């Protein structure tokens, strides 16, 4: 028996409890699992929006039904990230300014795939018509019925729970953690130790043999998962793995966050995350029943904590002194290696980018999934460790590049922040994709239809997502896809798809309940 | 109007007529298409086995139904490539020698997809049991019902045309070409010019403007497709694009081929291609109704034409002097760039490897598909041309590496040929895949494509078939007793499906005889 017998998980945030719950299922009770978390060292407390594979790839693997976890964490529905004032200069406002060309400064990044005609995605037929003056429709409204549904604040499900569109989730991060702790302890025999780690004990090769707690107790193990957060107490401190800082790709390094009570009866509930541009970064809005989570993300090199806090307060008309604020400074980048010896980093201890496209919790279940697949025995085959590390580095660097694109192609130059973005160098892979887009070619054409996690993880950002961000920001191909000049029957087939999107939007904008009404049913 | 108005295709083999037919459909009669071919300069004449995406990716785009084209080219069913005598030393025989362990030296590469349990393919559950002494079944027999069906020479369809398994096609290459000529001329307004090209006319920028024919005809065009074959009359000669020779990856560079009449009533028809190992390469067998195509592929550095011809003749017991033989010397590698200025190479003019896994016709429809997607206007955007060239180079290098693996992991050391294979440099991508396999991890896990066409199941078929095993089972299996048990049901389902189907299916012979009237 050369097997791992005990797994010790340091940290009890979303990362630790997601790791405990998942490994509990994957390892089928052949391994002891221990979570060491100090209740006195708080979880980061933010991490409130997600992507659509969360239910398929995570809660379904654990056999937890969507309605059960949503009810426990005051969850709401997310059909997109909505970008506001990313093209026009001035102070932060929740209200979109007007472009030179008369359009409102909003674009959507919704989920689910573009239809295609003659093997060409709808994006490319839209771009031809728009470059040729045959349409003044935005990419988002022409190519996704989700846009019309979001504009009307309608739910992605009917009241009897049949599905209308693709969606993701908004939720309370701390309640998701608590719900997962309860699951892991009562249903998967996970041992919960509430104490502080004071020592990391190693053998002659620098492999971890145990953690000591403040109370003197020693937890032995064969595999340690560092979910300690930004501190990286195992991967960075004990194991001395360097963190590769990547503020030369993205500038934000700070956030100030609160929860804002909300008249849902008056305003309705937005089924989307808003990314509201600011002078020195942007501000998230994550609606739930009764309130929305908000946070101004910023570079402390271009705003002081006090400056960011005031602009954030002004945005929502908050009193800066009778308002509770959570202040965070964050690393941007990844460990040189996520997994060193018998230490695997997961969550903020591994890697991080601004929450601009809700990538954090996805990084956690992607890592856990890859750990389950690459799960070692005590020989720790170096090839297993290398393949795991390679998956983590490509997943991160892909998403980092996609995020950089959101900033580098903002036309805003009104503040030193917005100008500073244009001074940063693009990575090669994102330059290559821009040149592809600019020639009218598709970028990362999606592989399957909606339907299987591994079948999405490869290249997570598809053609539709590049179009949402490039075209949303006003970067267009130089010319239409030249093949369209030879394909009049395919132009016409695409006109039926544009009409199908309009009809589905109009029909569903009429029949669907408000997000408010679906939430009110869901939460009793 | 900046558009291409006339496309001229040089060559009337499978490449030219596939190009004409496909572009005919893709370009929706916005473009004049001309095929210039000399009846007096023959087709390569071979190119008789395929892979399963042929119907999806080609005949379906043309709206031609499977039965219609099969009937016109004497087509038969291919459920695998069957490797014979690739592990044991000696002369070429069609009969499998006996391995050290007592079983026959045969393994299959079938197209059936592997089921999985707890997101792990059946390959890995097989490998665990085999490395731990818990099974004596080979990978192919344990993991695919297709193996039992092929051993019984049964068809991959019932007589009522319901599908049993995945499969590809065998066919007469010249009849496929003729059927496609007829389609292109009568249904897609393609002009067929029967003449020999003598000059390629270029403008001051080195772009082609027209081809001049022996009879003094000038064919003007905006875009030229070189389907001239190994000659590469446009891409290599006129356009001066260098061919990157890759005999440092694969040694074979020659073939001697014939067609052999066959008693189908007596022997039945094998629903597979056979790759029969020889002293200085291998010999294909491609069955159809009434005959099989065969050819000994070889390195001329390790056998003379006469040596290869004798061994090939001995194999089938042919009289070397009252037997018609097609002798070919072939390029191995690709053009530095497949598309230069307004010249696009397709087929043997583009790139080539030995027909070990029936990759030739796939290179044609993959290229044509990519040309339709990257179709230029007269500005010939440099980025469109570069992205096309990149897709061709990844498609080719993927398949080249997969082929190299068939040779580098043969245990045979009995001839200088088989030893010389161990001396060749492995490409980085195939070294990386071997290291992945050896750690028990999957290689290119399937999804439900042209640049990772060869999946986990195909790597297992070749590695495990040749006797290369992972070092140890996938370690995660040691923690998953419920998944081991779920996999036992799938092994039992393969056995049961094989037994059931081996009983209910018609013979390949009988399905062919129904199909061809
Ligand atoms: C501003 C911000 C916004 C974000 N927004 C999103 C979003 O919208 N969507 C999204 O998907 N992700 C988001 N993320 C990322 C997401 O929040 C994280 O991936 C997720 O919250 C998990 O964090 P964690 O568990 O790794 O770390 P933490 O929550 O910091 O957990 C650290 C744990 O380690 C324990 N610990 C520390 N030291 C010791 C010790 N010595 N002994 C014992 N225990 C110890 C603590 O007690 C705690 O339990 C955001 C992150 C930030 C910073
Ligand atoms: C030994 C061997 C085995 C193969 N086996 C397989 C297989 O099993 N499966 C598979 O999928 N593929 C296979 N292939 C590849 C496959 O045969 C080819 O991709 C395809 O069938 C034919 O290629 P082609 O049409 O480019 O060239 P060719 O058939 O050589 O055609 C060349 C054309 O150019 C014309 N031409 C040349 N010069 C002139 C001129 N000056 N004027 C006018 N016309 C001219 C000729 O008339 C002819 O029409 C094999 C290839 C070889 C060599
Ligand atoms: K290469």
Numbering used by the authors:
A (entry chain A): 2 to 452, 457 to 529
B (entry chain B): 2 to 449, 461 to 529
Please share text taken word for word from the publication where this structure appeared.
Flavin‐dependent halogenases require reduced flavin adenine dinucleotide (FADH2), O2, and halide salts to halogenate their substrates.
Because our attempts to cocrystallize Thal with FAD failed, we soaked crystals of apo‐Thal with FAD and NaCl or with a combination of l‐Trp, FAD, and NaCl resulting in the FAD‐Thal and Trp‐FAD‐Thal structures, respectively. In all structures both active sites are empty, FAD binds to both monomers with high occupancy and the FAD loop is closed. There are structural differences between FAD‐Thal and Trp‐Thal outside the FAD loop and the substrate‐binding loop. Thus, subtle structural changes in the tryptophan‐binding site might be directly coupled to the binding of FAD.
